[PDB]
Amino acid sequence: TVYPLHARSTGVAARQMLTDFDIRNINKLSKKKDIFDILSQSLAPSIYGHDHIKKAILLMLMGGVEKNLENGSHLRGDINILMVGDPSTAKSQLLRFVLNTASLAIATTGRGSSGVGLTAAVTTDREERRLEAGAMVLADRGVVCIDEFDKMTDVDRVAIHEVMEQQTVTIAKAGIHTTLNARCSVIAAANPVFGQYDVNRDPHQNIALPDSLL
Amino acid sequence: ISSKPLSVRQIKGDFLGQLITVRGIITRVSDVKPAVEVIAYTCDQCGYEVFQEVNSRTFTPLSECTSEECSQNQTKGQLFMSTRASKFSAFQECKIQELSQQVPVGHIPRSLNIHVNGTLVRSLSPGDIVDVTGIFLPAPYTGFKALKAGLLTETYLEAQFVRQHKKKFASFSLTSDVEERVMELITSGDVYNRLAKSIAPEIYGNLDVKKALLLLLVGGVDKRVGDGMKIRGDINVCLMGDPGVAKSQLLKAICKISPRGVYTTGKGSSGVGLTAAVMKDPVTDEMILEGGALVLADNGICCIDEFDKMDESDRTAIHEVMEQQTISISKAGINTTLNARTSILAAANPLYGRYNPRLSPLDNINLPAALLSRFDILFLMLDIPSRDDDEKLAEHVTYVHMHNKQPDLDFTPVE
Amino acid sequence: LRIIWGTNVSIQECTTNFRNFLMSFKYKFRKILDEREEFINNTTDEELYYIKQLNEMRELGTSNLNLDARNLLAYKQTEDLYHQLLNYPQEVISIMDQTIKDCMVSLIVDNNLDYDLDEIETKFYKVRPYNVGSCKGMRELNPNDIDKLINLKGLVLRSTPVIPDMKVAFFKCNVCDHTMAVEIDRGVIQEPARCERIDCNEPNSMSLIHNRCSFADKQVIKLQETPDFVPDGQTPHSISLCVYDELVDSCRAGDRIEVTGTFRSIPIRANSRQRVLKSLYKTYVDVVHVKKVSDKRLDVDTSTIEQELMQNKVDHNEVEEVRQITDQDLAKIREVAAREDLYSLLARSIAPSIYELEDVKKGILLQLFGGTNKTFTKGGRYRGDINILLCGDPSTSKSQILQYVHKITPRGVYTSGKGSSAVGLTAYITRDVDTKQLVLESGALVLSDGGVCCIDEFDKMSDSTRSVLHEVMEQQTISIAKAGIITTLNARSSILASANPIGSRYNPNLPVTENIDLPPPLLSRFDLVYLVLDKVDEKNDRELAKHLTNLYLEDKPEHISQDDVLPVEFLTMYISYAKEHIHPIITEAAKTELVRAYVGMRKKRITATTRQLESMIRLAEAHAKMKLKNVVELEDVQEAVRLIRSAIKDYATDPKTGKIDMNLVQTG
Ligand SMILES: Nc1ncnc2c1ncn2[C@@H]1O[C@H](COP(=O)(O)OP(=O)(O)O)[C@@H](O)[C@H]1O
Ligand SMILES: Nc1ncnc2c1ncn2[C@@H]1O[C@H](COP(=O)(O)OP(=O)(O)O)[C@@H](O)[C@H]1O
Ligand SMILES: Nc1ncnc2c1ncn2[C@@H]1O[C@H](COP(=O)(O)OP(=O)(O)O)[C@@H](O)[C@H]1O
Ligand code: BEF
Ligand code: BEF
Numbered sequence A: 001t002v003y004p005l006h007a008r009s010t011g012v013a014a015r016q017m018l019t020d021f022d023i024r025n026i027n028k029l030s031k032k033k034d035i036f037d038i039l040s041q042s043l044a045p046s047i048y049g050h051d052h053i054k055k056a057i058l059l060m061l062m063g064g065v066e067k068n069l070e071n072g073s074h075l076r077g078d079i080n081i082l083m084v085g086d087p088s089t090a091k092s093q094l095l096r097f098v099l100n101t102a103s104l105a106i107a108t109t110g111r112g113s114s115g116v117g118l119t120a121a122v123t124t125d126r127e128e129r130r131l132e133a134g135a136m137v138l139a140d141r142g143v144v145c146i147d148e149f150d151k152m153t154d155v156d157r158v159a160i161h162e163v164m165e166q167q168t169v170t171i172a173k174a175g176i177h178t179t180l181n182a183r184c185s186v187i188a189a190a191n192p193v194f195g196q197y198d199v200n201r202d203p204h205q206n207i208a209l210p211d212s213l214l
Numbered sequence B: 001i002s003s004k005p006l007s008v009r010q011i012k013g014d015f016l017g018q019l020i021t022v023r024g025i026i027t028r029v030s031d032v033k034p035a036v037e038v039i040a041y042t043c044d045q046c047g048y049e050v051f052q053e054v055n056s057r058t059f060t061p062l063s064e065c066t067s068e069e070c071s072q073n074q075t076k077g078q079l080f081m082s083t084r085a086s087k088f089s090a091f092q093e094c095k096i097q098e099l100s101q102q103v104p105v106g107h108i109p110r111s112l113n114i115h116v117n118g119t120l121v122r123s124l125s126p127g128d129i130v131d132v133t134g135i136f137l138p139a140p141y142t143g144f145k146a147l148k149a150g151l152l153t154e155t156y157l158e159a160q161f162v163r164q165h166k167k168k169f170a171s172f173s174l175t176s177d178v179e180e181r182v183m184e185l186i187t188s189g190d191v192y193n194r195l196a197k198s199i200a201p202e203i204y205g206n207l208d209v210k211k212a213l214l215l216l217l218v219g220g221v222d223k224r225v226g227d228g229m230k231i232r233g234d235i236n237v238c239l240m241g242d243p244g245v246a247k248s249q250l251l252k253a254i255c256k257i258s259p260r261g262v263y264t265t266g267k268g269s270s271g272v273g274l275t276a277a278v279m280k281d282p283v284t285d286e287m288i289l290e291g292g293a294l295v296l297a298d299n300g301i302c303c304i305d306e307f308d309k310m311d312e313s314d315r316t317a318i319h320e321v322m323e324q325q326t327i328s329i330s331k332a333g334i335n336t337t338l339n340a341r342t343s344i345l346a347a348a349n350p351l352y353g354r355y356n357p358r359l360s361p362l363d364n365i366n367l368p369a370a371l372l373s374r375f376d377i378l379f380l381m382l383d384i385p386s387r388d389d390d391e392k393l394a395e396h397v398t399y400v401h402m403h404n405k406q407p408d409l410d411f412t413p414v415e
Numbered sequence C: 001l002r003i004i005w006g007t008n009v010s011i012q013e014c015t016t017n018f019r020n021f022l023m024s025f026k027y028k029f030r031k032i033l034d035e036r037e038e039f040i041n042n043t044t045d046e047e048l049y050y051i052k053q054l055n056e057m058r059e060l061g062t063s064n065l066n067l068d069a070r071n072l073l074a075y076k077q078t079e080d081l082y083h084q085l086l087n088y089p090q091e092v093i094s095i096m097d098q099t100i101k102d103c104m105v106s107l108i109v110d111n112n113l114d115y116d117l118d119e120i121e122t123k124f125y126k127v128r129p130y131n132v133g134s135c136k137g138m139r140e141l142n143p144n145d146i147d148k149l150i151n152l153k154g155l156v157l158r159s160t161p162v163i164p165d166m167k168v169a170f171f172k173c174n175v176c177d178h179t180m181a182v183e184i185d186r187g188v189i190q191e192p193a194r195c196e197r198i199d200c201n202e203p204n205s206m207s208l209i210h211n212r213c214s215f216a217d218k219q220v221i222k223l224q225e226t227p228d229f230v231p232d233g234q235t236p237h238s239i240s241l242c243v244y245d246e247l248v249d250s251c252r253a254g255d256r257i258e259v260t261g262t263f264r265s266i267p268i269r270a271n272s273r274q275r276v277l278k279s280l281y282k283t284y285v286d287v288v289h290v291k292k293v294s295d296k297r298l299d300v301d302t303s304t305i306e307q308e309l310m311q312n313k314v315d316h317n318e319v320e321e322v323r324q325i326t327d328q329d330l331a332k333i334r335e336v337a338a339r340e341d342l343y344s345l346l347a348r349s350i351a352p353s354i355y356e357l358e359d360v361k362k363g364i365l366l367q368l369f370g371g372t373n374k375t376f377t378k379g380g381r382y383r384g385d386i387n388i389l390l391c392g393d394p395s396t397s398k399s400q401i402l403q404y405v406h407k408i409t410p411r412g413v414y415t416s417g418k419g420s421s422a423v424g425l426t427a428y429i430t431r432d433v434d435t436k437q438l439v440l441e442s443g444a445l446v447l448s449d450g451g452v453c454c455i456d457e458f459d460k461m462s463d464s465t466r467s468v469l470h471e472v473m474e475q476q477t478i479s480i481a482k483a484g485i486i487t488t489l490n491a492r493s494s495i496l497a498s499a500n501p502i503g504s505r506y507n508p509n510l511p512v513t514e515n516i517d518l519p520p521p522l523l524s525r526f527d528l529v530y531l532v533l534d535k536v537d538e539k540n541d542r543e544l545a546k547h548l549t550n551l552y553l554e555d556k557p558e559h560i561s562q563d564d565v566l567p568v569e570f571l572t573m574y575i576s577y578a579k580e581h582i583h584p585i586i587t588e589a590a591k592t593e594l595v596r597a598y599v600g601m602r603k604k605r606i607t608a609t610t611r612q613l614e615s616m617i618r619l620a621e622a623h624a625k626m627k628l629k630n631v632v633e634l635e636d637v638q639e640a641v642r643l644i645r646s647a648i649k650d651y652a653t654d655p656k657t658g659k660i661d662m663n664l665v666q667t668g
């Protein structure tokens, strides 16, 4: 027997058994008008407030519907959330909870997971030129909990655009032309460059992220 | 069952020996080399031609004429090989790969070997998307003996019939049926505008860019005067513009219509995708050069995305690719000049992301005067909000989402 | 009947038809075939062609007859011999060898020459056919095309050392001291168990003595394919040529050749698995004929191969290393040199398609001729190579000029900046697949020896890569000292370089030096630095647009030029002859003019150095060679100085500032 086991920040999805009792409870609870508020409150009971952030996280967990058309165009059905704020604002706590509650979530830090670490890259294995799936490919149909987004290298954040929008990773390297599928929802937390958000300065100065990434 | 095309993962051990159709991309194709079916030896002592069948990767020659007389009489005839008298066959060890649609969630594509034999050779080229139909035959295990546990078998697919999903441009014959489908298009009237609006119908209001992309697909005329001057004869389009104006989706649409074209993007990955270095092919032991993305996109469209965020080293090669249609390499181990006739389509953002009208266009496009000269058309595609066009786009997109089809009722998007 | 089994070749019919073709071949037949009736000259077409050629071959004593395939095609009765030779080269070629022997014997006997017939009897006469059809490429050769004579052409990347080939082996029974002689039959020399005679019979009686055996010479040449037509997405291939007998060492590395030979496939042995052959055969091409000289390119420099010419004479390879010059062609050369506008005509016949770049076209031609290769017999030498730099605004046709030069020159390598590396040029170490042992190859600079190395996009090239340029740039040699290799390599290569001024467009504000942006050491070495400038001139732009549009009028256009230009074949003849016969020398008046110009020049913008004097000397020498003179005169030195002044636009440059006035920088 082989049992794939779910562990935090691993490719194995965490499915659960739904009894008829559980489905009945879900159906009954969905009838309430305040169902969105009730669910959103339950995401982070420990964290005080941030109710709009919790609602956004819940919507991310639900996700959207990706659309595929006849001509071949693919329309993104995943929503990405970025949190920028002062230190000790419980952003890392929310990221950790998202990692701890999603069916398939992958946790990365700022620069520990480089551009090679994210997406994917050829390993050039001698047994030849195998492809190794990085974080985002392994997080297909899942969430990527990037922490300290601001510390990320510019080069690292260059490679993230295609995964964010087209949801594909194109290798086109060393004679290997491949388009891996990376349909991942990205959530990131990053402090402003000046340590604390500056009301006197415009948000463009504080964020310092490229306009395309925002 | 042979009708249904199967992904590589679905070719289990059950299907061995049957006639199956595998659908996927072709990555590596070997050169055509003579494969021995039956090797013919000549024994001049008894004047007999003896033929030894060969049915493996290897074999062994003979020493004693096994024909009746030399084995029977005291005469022991020496036998010599004859290449012209022996039987050969054109052979090619291709390698098909799984598509992105067929790969399940979280896995990576896996490959299956194809042994193209006979007159079917040279019917498969790298980058092709085909449904090869063949016989899933087993072969004796070829790996390390320690890992062997029982009669392990390596498997391949002996190709029988090849169907191309996207027909090559160089393979067009005006057969009566193609003639009728074509004249029916002519009689539709306004073929230029209909074809322009046809590409990527889900995108609204960007029609001049669609016309430019259609011109890019059609291509000009290469001129080679008697002296030796060669003009490019192909268009190099750029799509500089603000974020969120559907440049990447236009590029992907063009990739869909175009028969050959690589969607090279970003940085770092492109660094080795244009190097074209040298490596040894497993099948023939030939030190074949490997082509990069641009060579694989020969006579195609290079669809370079995120042009501005890509390393200057590759832009240096893009210079020569755009102008001379060839790549000159003089690095260690390689002293050749690759032939890469390509039309480059580039999508990029201006300097400082969103266009700043205050800065001059040249200061904001950021392209050097040499590189910008090679672009036949350089669109601006600036995003300028307006209460009318914004709601037009919003209605178009909402219709596209609510029905998976372009909003225009009367329009007919050509297949 | 009586045909060879497996072939349509019949010895009697083939011999008879080949004899009839040899006796009764008229070049007027070929001219009729090649639609040359308008160009027919029965003053030499009516005479027996191969009969006269064989008479010359007998007189000289050469042992090789270079047979043309289309010659066999033209004569109607021997048309089938063309297909027979193409399909069955081995037997047919042996038959032709026998027929040549018989016909030569008949020719000698009929004319009743007094010398003994047996003295010339013992000599193997080999026929070396060529021009057998079009290239067809090489990747398209199906296995049904094994052992068929084919035409290949491409660069020669590398050549193996001569490898001895045993044909006759010498055994010896040690006890009985009886020498043994066994020939080769399909690559095997049978081992006799007993002795040849009846002295003794033992199981292991004799032992092989390799040194006593007879060995023939075999060299493996690696050629890189350059087909006219290449399928989409195909990288250049590489085929291993195998040569024999006099063809050994005939071809040097970097030579664009046109080789004809027999396609061959051979079983290959598994690694360390004794006597097990892989089913997939390895294909290689034999060699019968090599055509180094081509009329589309200049001839190979005589100076570089002068030492090897004596060794070739010793070998009697009979390869046409250098094209011969016909007498009437020499007269035409003389009359063309007698023309008043020889200089303009030759300049504009270089890159005819380019428009209104006469100063640049000139410099290119003077580079193509080159200065006198003086040989200081006491020690040291001076080479007459001239290097040109083209730093100019974009879209000024510089890359096209480099392409034309690369096509014209005999041994040239095209390179573009970042596609190059320091180890990439010069020489490096690599491992062959076949030998599986380390070998040495040649970079672009070494392969460009005796030619022009068109270096494109100079400025984009790294400062590190450009460092190695100095050595070959000044003293025309490269001396490497790296892991395993310590030697000096003579790279007599004239560098042609194109660059874009920094900013991609010339800045009128900054001086010439700052726009060019090259270090003074590297900048000074360049003999001529051309500041090609694209200025918006309505008349010039109109003329250029009209010319370019007229280029588009018809599908295969003849060039649209007002003035007549020389044929490229005749231009190659002129340039080759001028380079190899004529070695001009300097005069006292030219010496005084050179000194005066050098002094006046050395009076911010780049400061002239002694390299400028050497550039003036070499340019004057080149101009002397162009006019066919054996001495240089003061007007040539003045012309060289004028060219140097015009290349950098010295008139329009500010004297002390170094800035260029745009009003006076206008050209023709
Ligand atoms: N609003 C909050 N409610 C509850 N705990 C909070 C809140 N804000 C911060 N904390 C606590 O403060 C600490 C810092 O949170 P953390 O997520 O590490 O901050 P940062 O935003 O710097 O990553 C945690 O122990 C967290 O529980
Ligand atoms: N004119 C448009 N028509 C249709 N969709 C559009 C249009 N402009 C933007 N979009 C949408 O906006 C998103 C941007 O797509 P993308 O091609 O990645 O943008 P870009 O590459 O220009 O930054 C996609 O979801 C796309 O469908
Ligand atoms: N003066 C000219 N004469 C002929 N062709 C020219 C001229 N100027 C530009 N062209 C044409 O314009 C193009 C620019 O040439 P190219 O060598 O590619 O430019 P660059 O000098 O930037 O390398 C070529 O197609 C060339 O034929
Ligand atoms: F101080 Be926090 F982790 F933004
Ligand atoms: F933000 Be887009 F990919 F130009």
Ligand code: BEF
Binding pocket: B323, B370, B371, B373, C392, C393, C394, C395, C396, C398, C399, C499, C500
């Ligand atoms: F724009 Be050119 F290649 F100098």
Ligand SMILES: [Mg+2]
Binding pocket: A091, A092, A147, A148, A189
């Ligand atoms: Mg944190």
Ligand SMILES: [Mg+2]
Binding pocket: B247, B248, B305, B306, B347
């Ligand atoms: Mg984009």
Ligand SMILES: [Mg+2]
Binding pocket: B323, C398, C399, C456, C457, C498
């Ligand atoms: Mg150029």
Ligand SMILES: [Zn+2]
Binding pocket: B043, B044, B045, B046, B047, B048, B065, B066, B067, B069, B070, B076, B077, B078
């Ligand atoms: Zn026998």
Ligand SMILES: [Zn+2]
Binding pocket: C173, C174, C175, C176, C177, C178, C195, C199, C200, C201, C205
């Ligand atoms: Zn003996």
